[PDB]
Amino acid sequence: GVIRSIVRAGQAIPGPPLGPILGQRGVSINQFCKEFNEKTKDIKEGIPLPTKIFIKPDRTFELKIGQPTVSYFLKAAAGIEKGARHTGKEVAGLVSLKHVYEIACVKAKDDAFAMQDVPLSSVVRSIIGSARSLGIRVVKDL
Amino acid sequence: RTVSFQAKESMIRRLEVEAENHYWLSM
Amino acid sequence: NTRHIAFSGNKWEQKVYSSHTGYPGGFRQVTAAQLHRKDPVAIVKLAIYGMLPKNLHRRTMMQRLHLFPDEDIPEDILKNLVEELPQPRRVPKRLDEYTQEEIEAFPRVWTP
Amino acid sequence: HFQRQKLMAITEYIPPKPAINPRCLPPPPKPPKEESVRLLRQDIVAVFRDNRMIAVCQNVALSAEDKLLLRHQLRKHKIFIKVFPSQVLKPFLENSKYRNLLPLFVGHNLLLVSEEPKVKEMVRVLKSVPFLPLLGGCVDDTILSRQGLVDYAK
Amino acid sequence: VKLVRVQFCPFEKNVESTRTFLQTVSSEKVRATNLNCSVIADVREPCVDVLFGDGYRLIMRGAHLTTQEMLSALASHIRD
Amino acid sequence: LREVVKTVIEGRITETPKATPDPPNPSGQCPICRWNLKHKYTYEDVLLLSQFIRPYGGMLPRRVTGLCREEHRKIEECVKMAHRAGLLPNHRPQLPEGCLPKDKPKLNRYLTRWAPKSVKPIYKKGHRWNKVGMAVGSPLLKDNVCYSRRPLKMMH
């Protein structure tokens, strides 16, 4: 069973958001954190990571992780930790072309998140759309 | 009180007769 | 052959006969099917009685009426009998009643 | 009153009766066909014209993600997994280079479209999934069997 | 059902019923349900053979049998 | 028409009876339209009805017959009337394994719109203007040709 979470690598035992939710199906919580901690060492600590854990009926762990979220990076790039109430029109940061493109080039390395499209148009739309989801406007130049 | 079939026909015939009276009063 | 009469539609289950003895709790309502089960000839007699004129002569006419549930008849009645009357309703034929020649004549409208 | 009611009944509207009911009507003409779907024609036309030989294999209950992975796998084989809704596939022959390949494209089946006669790469794709059945390969856009495909491929 | 064998000739006249029946058997959900089954498809009239451990072998030809008849017959057998 | 013989089984496609050639009205969308029989059949016309019924009295699928829905409802209603009247001795319901009839007498009925099982008795008949009506015939057959001076009394 696929369970998607965005928990940060820095903390390997968030508690309710992972521990019992994975535990409810029936798993070893300690085992989950140890492998997540293994991911934490490889990756920078304190940055959210999408996970695609599959909880099979055999009570086994199939942990798959990818690049850190561009959404949080856009929030960090805009210097925003907690956004506006709505964020539909509220904006606190503007991102230019060069910053947008640089991250996209590195982004196209994971078998997950469908980062295999030859054209970069697909890549930009997700981050552009992600910025729309966040309180960020992606202006061409400022 | 639903109208009998015979009653409807009888009035129609009389109406036609009065129509003939109208034509002969038209000249 | 009053036992073998046929009722159109659902008259068997829908027609109810109501009679009152005249004493307390004397009201009786019986369905046509129940009445036939109790007596096959009762239904035929009741219908004729109602159709007959509501006069003193009706009772005398009922005496002259003879109702037999089945084909059995006394021999003397047959000697008294002068003529038989054609059945009012033509009986539709069943699948078996249809002749083999008729089946051949009838066309097959569609092919499965 | 009863008398007024009599007038209403006579004045009641009388509807005319059609000669033949719509279901039991004689065969009437129908409007000319219109191609809505037209976009999908261009995509399939390009891929089939580009690729002379097409290997037609029935699609097992595969996942969308795997198809992209298999699409990349064929890129190693120099083949492309380009597929589109099959309800527009049948009219492809109506408006395309050929009109006679309809029987080959029957049902829902994976199409391996290759422009080059790299037999080994095509055979390797067959080796990827044995349970998946390969209907055949129309080498040089000529109808052929799976066994014939190998024989001609040799 | 330990094994299910489906054989049909696509190049020659191929019956839709047997081909459609193959799709139902070759499904991610159907295969998981009858996990014991080993799915083998023969591609080259069509003959479908299913082998059971108890020795019951059921052979179905789709030339004059629809997929529903095979599915109906197979479904009862799987329950056992 | 396919029949299956039965494990190893074999299905044989057998010859099906063909419709008589030269319909009176060729090009009719439905067979009734083809044969000009729209308003000339009744429940007593078992010969036509039997062709569209299962061997045990079940209704055949409309798609196989190809007739329009209007005739489908009319034909089904006519067949229903025949069954309740005991006019289909060879299409009687199949007894599943070993069941036998209750052996009680069957009342002779015809022109039965609804099943006698589910019809309640009418205790209160009513007066002249409050009389209750007893359904006779079916609404689906209103359009049938009538040879009487006045329309037939559906409610008795």
Place this chain on the structure above:
Amino acid sequence: YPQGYVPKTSLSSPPWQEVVL
């Protein structure tokens, strides 16, 4: 079947019977 042919049924033919003078 010839044109204008109607198989005899309950409703195909009138209840009255034609006569020839």
Place this chain on the structure above:
Amino acid sequence: LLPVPTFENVSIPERSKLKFVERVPLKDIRGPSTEATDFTEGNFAILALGGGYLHWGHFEMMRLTINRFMDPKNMFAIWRVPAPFKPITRIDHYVTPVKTGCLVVEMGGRCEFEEVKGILNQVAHKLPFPAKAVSRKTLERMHQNQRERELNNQNPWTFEHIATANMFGIRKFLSPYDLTQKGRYWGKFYMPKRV
């Protein structure tokens, strides 16, 4: 496929909600509707099929129900009738007389008829008179159907010819208003199927 319809041109007034109706202020309802028979702003409304008396509770039922369910972003509502003024002695309540064919409430905005059919029908059922939810397209179809039935009538004798010609002295047993109704309106009720 074909392009989807759009309601961009539609403009929603600021006063989306319905205004309050006062509790308190002879053939008013025995005739055909002469006012509010045409759609003014919205494409949907409620059409009176009978002559009824609308008390304050009915107005609140229309006002409260419409306001709670309507979307100010895409919907607006207006009042097509005055407040109750006719007293009902026990005075228990006051009512607004309505004539057959009067539009009582009109709603518009960026919405489809099907969206408002359920609410309008519920309001119509709660109304004191028979009523039917109507729209610009549906209302025209009713008139088009009304015209078609009238045009193709096969009756040799018509109500107007007999009434205007005083055949059988029918006018002795008919009211003066009946000539205008032409059999389509009886008392305070209107017969839609009378053609």
Place this chain on the structure above:
RNA sequence: UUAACCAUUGUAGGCCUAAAAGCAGCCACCAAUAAAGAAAGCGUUCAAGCUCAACAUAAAAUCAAAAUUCCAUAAUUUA
């Protein structure tokens, strides 16, 4: 319009929310793919998770005729 089938991936996207991920609130409202609603009803310690819309494969086509005891009998077609 309404009958069969299926549901991948960005992203638990920002919001006081412990946490709310389509689905507590709250947002604006894009992408890839052949086909995915930044979600339609469900589920909700929160989520996992049920389906509807997706794509493929189905097939259709303007309203009727309360307390004494039931109360004519009946009846669908010969002009």
